[PDB]
Amino acid sequence: QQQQESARRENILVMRLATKEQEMQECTTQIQYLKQVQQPSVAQLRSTMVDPAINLFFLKMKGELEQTKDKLEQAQNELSAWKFTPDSQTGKKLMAKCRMLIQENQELGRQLSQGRIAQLEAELALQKKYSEELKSSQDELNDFIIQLDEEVEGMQSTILVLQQQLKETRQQLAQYQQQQSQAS
Amino acid sequence: QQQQESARRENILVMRLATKEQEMQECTTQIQYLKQVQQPSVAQLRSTMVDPAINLFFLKMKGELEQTKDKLEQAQNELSAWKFTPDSQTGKKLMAKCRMLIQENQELGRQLSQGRIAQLEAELALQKKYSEELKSSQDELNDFIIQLDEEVEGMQSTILVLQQQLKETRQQLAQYQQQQSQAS
Amino acid sequence: PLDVIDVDWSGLMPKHPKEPREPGAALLKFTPGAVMLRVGISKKLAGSELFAKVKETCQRLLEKPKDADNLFEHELGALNMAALLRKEERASLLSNLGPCCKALCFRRDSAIRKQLVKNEKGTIKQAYTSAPMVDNELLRLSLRLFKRKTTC
Amino acid sequence: VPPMTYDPYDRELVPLLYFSCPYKTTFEIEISRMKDQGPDKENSGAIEASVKLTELLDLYREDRGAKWVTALEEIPSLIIKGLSYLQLKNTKQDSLGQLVDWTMQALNLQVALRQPIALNVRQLKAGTKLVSSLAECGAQGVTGLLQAGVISGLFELLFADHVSSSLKLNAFKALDSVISMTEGMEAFLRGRQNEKSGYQKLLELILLDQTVRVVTAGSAILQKCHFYEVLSEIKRLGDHLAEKTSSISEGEIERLINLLEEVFHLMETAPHTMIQQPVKSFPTMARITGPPERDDPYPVLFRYLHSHHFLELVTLLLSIPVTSAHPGVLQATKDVLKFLAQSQKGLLFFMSEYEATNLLIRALCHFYDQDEEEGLQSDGVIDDAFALWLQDSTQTLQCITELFSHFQRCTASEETDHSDLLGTLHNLYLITFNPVGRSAVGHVFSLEKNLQSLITLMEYYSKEALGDSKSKKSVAYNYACILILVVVQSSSDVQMLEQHAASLLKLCKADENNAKLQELGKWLEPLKNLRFEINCIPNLIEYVKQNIDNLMTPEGVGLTTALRVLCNVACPPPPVEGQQKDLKWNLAVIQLFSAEGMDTFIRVLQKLNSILTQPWRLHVNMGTTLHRVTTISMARCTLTLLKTMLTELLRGGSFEFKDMRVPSALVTLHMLLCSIPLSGRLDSDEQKIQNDIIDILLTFTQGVNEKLTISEETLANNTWSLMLKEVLSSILKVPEGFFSGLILLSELLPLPLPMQTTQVIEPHDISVALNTRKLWSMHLHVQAKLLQEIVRSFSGTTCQPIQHMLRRICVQLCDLASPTALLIMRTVLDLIVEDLQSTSEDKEKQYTSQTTRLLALLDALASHKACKLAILHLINGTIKGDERYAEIFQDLLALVRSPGDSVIRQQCVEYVTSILQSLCDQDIALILPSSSEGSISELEQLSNSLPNKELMTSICDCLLATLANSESSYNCLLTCVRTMMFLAEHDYGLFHLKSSLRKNSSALHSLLKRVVSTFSKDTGELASSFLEFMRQILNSDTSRTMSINAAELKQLLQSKEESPENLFLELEKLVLEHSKDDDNLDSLLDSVVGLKQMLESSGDPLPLSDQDVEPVLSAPESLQNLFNNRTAYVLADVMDDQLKSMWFTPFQAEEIDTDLDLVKVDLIELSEKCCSDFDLHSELERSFLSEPSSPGRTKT
């Protein structure tokens, strides 16, 4: 019909209006962000501390300072290495530092060995085997619980049957010794 | 029915959509201005206000950078003076090895804490904990099964006593009938 | 200067060396007293005699005469359970932290401090600082609806 | 055309249409469906049951044999369909009555023992199942059972001897099915007269030693009985309030608040303590046995909440002025409503009580209006928009019903209704414009096959318009696309995808040219061939690891899903009490370590902050709410994964985790997300992110035993000390991270002692609270060299937040133990002594505004217990290198006793006088004063809380010279007379005050001349304090054993030959203040006429005594001993104001914000060539903002 497609196009138009309204709402929220009347203190902090110029210059100065510091480290230790003689105090302490460094490097290479990784994987496989053994014990234990429940139900049925037998024979013997004590 | 007023609603919806899209364009230009205009140039970059704490940071870093640079130049001038000695070359190679070990030891310590061995020890501890929790709850399930089997043995004792009572009352009825049929 | 410090090392969580359990000691928290403590009973619909008997069964399970005679002071059941849970939570506020548990932090310490300042009944009363827009039309509608529902 | 503008509260709820009520049982649901829907051919499955059900009820009318037992075993499968058809067809021989009598015959033990062996207990079990299936049959069936005596019938099997424990579990299931109806619960709580009630029978049954699962079922019945009872007491209190307000103690209102929080806490732990566990499920601490299937207790907690009109009660409580005024009532009822609105059942509860829900939405929206109408709503009363959230949640579920029940109509007919479908989709889309409305839409479609609505809508209109458009755009298809896109984007509970990830993907594959459907496909990519189990988290980790490069990028947005699905299936929900731990949450963590997870979550965090760091600096701050919600969801999910991994690894015994990428990435993610919120207060999700960051940073403080603290070699390499290094050395790294590192280091450290308790803390817990602080101090004294740099760098700043956070840390971190206390205080004192030196020599000290800020820090520190004693043990003069501290204190005293006249020195003298006041205050100490016996003696509590002899002499000299010198300010004189009032409370302080008055004898006289010379109505406070101090020296002559009479007091006041008439001046002006004003003048002339009556009581000229003996003080205990024996708790029912001062934001508009920022003009460009040659800063800074201004992955 004519009003058919007329209302269909009206639906498409209100769809476009809704999506444009969503975009306008997003832009309005972003305005409320950018035109927020923030606290004086948070504005103070944003302007003084996270200002990109001051912050980037701080980065550059820290980097240059640490570069110069490690360069001075390199130069000073190279000096003390030129001043190295085997029985010097700095000499003994330096070869001892290198020796304990070799010790620590041997230790670290040991803790990273393929032998240590193999022992750790063996322990992990052993623990996984133990956990699946516990799961198998758990299945055994579940079946034991099922057996116990089935047999207590059977025993309760047996008790009820025995109580019925007992009541029957007991009332029989009672009525008998009663009505036959009635006979002289 | 008629399409006139519905098409009128359609085209006024179109003009509403045009107004909304132009408001959205205004919002986009406004947020672009608000978010991109702030850029500091040499004009303000040469008259930046900084906190007293940040200025003290800059002054401390400048001062200690100057001191470290001075000691650095001094040490590197002293480096050019020292002449080649056998023990000096021994110390040079010794401390080259010392540096390389200083670097390799941290490169290996980060592997020991972020690599395969850390994941393996974590899986191992977690599997140990999982198995210990599974077993610590299977112990409670074993105590509850002790409860159930005590129930079993109690019901079995009751079955035994009821069976003895049924037997004695049944033989009592048999004998009382065999007597009081000829007597009573 | 800057005095030498050492710590007595006793805040670690209990059962750390984990000495093995006694056979038949997992059904110890399922005795009548231990169950009634976790559940709590109500005096107004358990009766006088039965409430007395249950409180007696619970008392001889508690080892602290303070808590033993502070048992079940409310007439509601869930309120008794909540009072016991609050007693145990207050007792466990500072007991589980330190060496082998996560050390104290600002959030957790603030929480346990706001817990310590709460008296029993578990609440510190807030003072009025604001009030809603009293729309007595809404109040009339609410009262009418509540009464209608209470009737049918 | 629908209104594209949205007023959220204009639409209101109507009765449910598609989803059955949550409290209705299956029988009632079936009978209502067959009633209203009429005689459909769904009757078919009914009749073959019904005619069968009546063929068993007419075949065993009086037969009770084995065949009857086999019929009992069959009846429960026919009561749902059969009995309902019978009851609604009104073909009634009272088949329900015959069923109830069958049930009473079956539960009978006498009838039971007359059966064969295999099936005498089968009859009892079948009668139990009959109870359970007939109580779930409406008021009709449950009252039929109750009248026939089912409670005292079930309590025959439970009390009989020699009965299977499985049969008792069955009888308990039957009893839980009876009392799940409110008629049953009423008959169970209040039994017949001259009989024990069901509750009393149950209590008597538990008091016999029962099997573990039997007493657990008893506990599960008792918990539900207590819940019903709490609800009944709430209903009683509410009806009381209704009758009292129609035509109220604070005690009963606090009781109502307690009952409401009790209802909340009972509904929270209900699926663990109110359900009947299966007969094979034991209550072990970790579920290992029995079926996994449990039955949720909410379909009966809602029957209770409905039979007691709980929503009407909360509507009243929120609409009645006296109770609504309480914040406790609002918060406690909002807890319950927010819990109800979490689940599909609870959300259908609100829509069943649609009238009560409308009125409740109104009563809740009134609060959220007045909140910003009178308050500012950032740190006062909390605002979470719960009114709007609940309105939009119930509205979107109403639209879900209107959208489901439009496909129950197009398959029983064909489409004659399209416009209402489209209007529903539109009113559902408009809700997704807010962030709260969008969160509610994403949360409601994420509940129990609700997403199936839009899914089947798109499956329909993809066979009608070839998807998007065949000859018509089929706008409903586009609405459904947008909706199933916003729910996938915004939801964080990703369980909904578990069953739909297939369908949606097919949809995403059925239309490859739809701009929204292919984005949805990118969102669902990690769910191709996935199963949401702990065996496929290796695949999810492989996905997160394979395209980690695309994080804030629309082509790697599906990674977000791969971190929600991976947080849904591997992170246990926050555990509630009474819950038995499931063991898969262990395996889910093991599999989360096997497939490398510590690596590919550290990498997620690292790339997350490497992406966010540039918009953070450029102040874009996650603008578009879509990108913000995805980045917050990704951060929170990665943090939850890391938190569960570390807290599950580090609890499995004492383990040591030294990755050191986790803290270095977290102290940056905190800076980027949680540190500087432009609102000045963290959000909810950002607060959760900060809490997760602090928890992960604290999991490095576990596993620290004696064997890890013997030597400084094994202490500085400990995991605690490594985390502390990565947190501290990340504070002085970049000025952007200053405030973040501070607001984080202050969340790691514990609050300062003493604890304000209502009751005593047993010595073990105070020992633990002392030892955890000793341990924090032991681990901080290795980073002492960074703590000193922190308190040297920020001390002397004008940024109010950083200043306040440093001022807070220096109290938290100074109260841990003696070493760190002396560390912080030595640093602050060295800082002030090098600020007073290094600029002054051969002359007086130069005081600048840097000195002013430094003294302000020292002041606001000295007013705390630990910091003040750390000052005292440095000024005292026992030199450990501490001579300069005593010298600088003498220099500060010289400053105050000779202020000169400036605006800087007149600003520093008030700070040093506040210092002096905090030093001479005995209510500020580690050993707090207490006249309770068995404690420290009074005179030995001042030897450890006041200056020593030669320091107290100088302090009294200074406090007098600052009164004599009339150049002093007003606040200075106020704090000095306050310090004098403090010192005038004991013979030590008063002896020194008098002995100093013997040198400066015109101190109080000139002070009184100052009081009268510049008196005003605001100056009255100084006069009041001075007259209080005056009385405090004569109140004893009509605590201390040595005071002055009125005679020599007035002699000290006697320096003018009109000083009595100076008192007369004060009097005549005092009555002349207003006589038009407050209680100032009458109290003040009371005091001063008392003083002048003591004046006339004696002759004035009397020299002050000299025969008095000084009360000597013992050696001050070493600061370590004071920190050892410190008051760890005080009996007070209110928080200390100093502790309460640490809870509000560090962002204060201006109360610490200095009017003189001393912002030093610095020329940055010249500071390049003076250093090593560096880039032109203009180029570097313009490289960042030219093109890339949108949030997320940008140029740099």
Residue numbers in the entry:
A (entry chain C), B (entry chain D): 64 to 247
C (entry chain B): 1492 to 1643
D (entry chain A): 333 to 579, 619 to 1409, 1428 to 1585
Quote the original article.
The m6A “writer” consists of the catalytic subunit m6A-METTL complex (MAC) and the regulatory subunit m6A-METTL-associated complex (MACOM), the latter being essential for enzymatic activity. Deposition of m6A onto RNAs is achieved by the m6A methyltransferase complex (m6A writer), a large holocomplex of ~1000 kDa in size that contains methyltransferase-like 3 and 14 (METTL3/14), Wilms’ tumor 1-associated protein (WTAP), KIAA1429 (VIRMA), Zinc finger CCCH domain-containing protein 13 (ZC3H13), RNA binding motif protein 15/15 paralog (RBM15/15B), and E3 ubiquitin ligase CBLL1 (HAKAI). Here, we report the cryo-electron microscopy (cryo-EM) structures of MACOM at a 3.0-Å resolution, uncovering that WTAP and VIRMA form the core structure of MACOM and that ZC3H13 stretches the conformation by binding VIRMA. Our cryo-EM structure reveals that WTAP forms a homodimer, with each monomer consisting of four tandem helices (H1–H4/H1’–H4’ with coiled-coil interactions) and three linkers (L1–L3/L1’–L3’).
To understand the structural basis of the MACOM function, we determined the 3.0-Å resolution structures of the HWVZ and HWV complexes using single-particle cryo-EM analysis. To our surprise, in the cryo-EM structure of the HWVZ complex, only three components (WTAP, VIRMA, and ZC3H13) can be found, while HAKAI is missing, although it is present in the SDS-PAGE analysis, indicating the high flexibility of HAKAI. Human WTAP (residues 64–247), VIRMA (residues 334–1585), and ZC3H13 (residues 1492–1643) form a compact structure shaped like a “warhorse” that represents the core of human MACOM. Unlike WTAP and VIRMA that form saddle- and horse-like conformations, respectively, the C-terminal fragment of ZC3H13 is only one-tenth of its full length and contains eight α-helices, but it does not exhibit a rigid conformation. Instead, it attaches to the Belly, Chest, and Neck domains of VIRMA and functions like a barding to protect the horse body (Supplementary informaiton, Video S1). Therefore, this fragment of ZC3H13 is called the Barding domain. The Barding domain of ZC3H13 has a strong interaction with VIRMA, and the interface is ~4435 Å2, involving seven salt bridges and 19 hydrogen bonds. In contrast, the interaction between the Barding domain and WTAP is weak, with an interface area of ~256 Å2 in which highly conserved residues R1512 and F1521 of the first α-helix of the Barding domain form salt bridges and hydrophobic interactions with D206 and F207 in H4 of WTAP-a, respectively. Our structural study shows that ZC3H13 uses its C-terminal Barding domain to interact with VIRMA and induce the conformational change of MACOM.
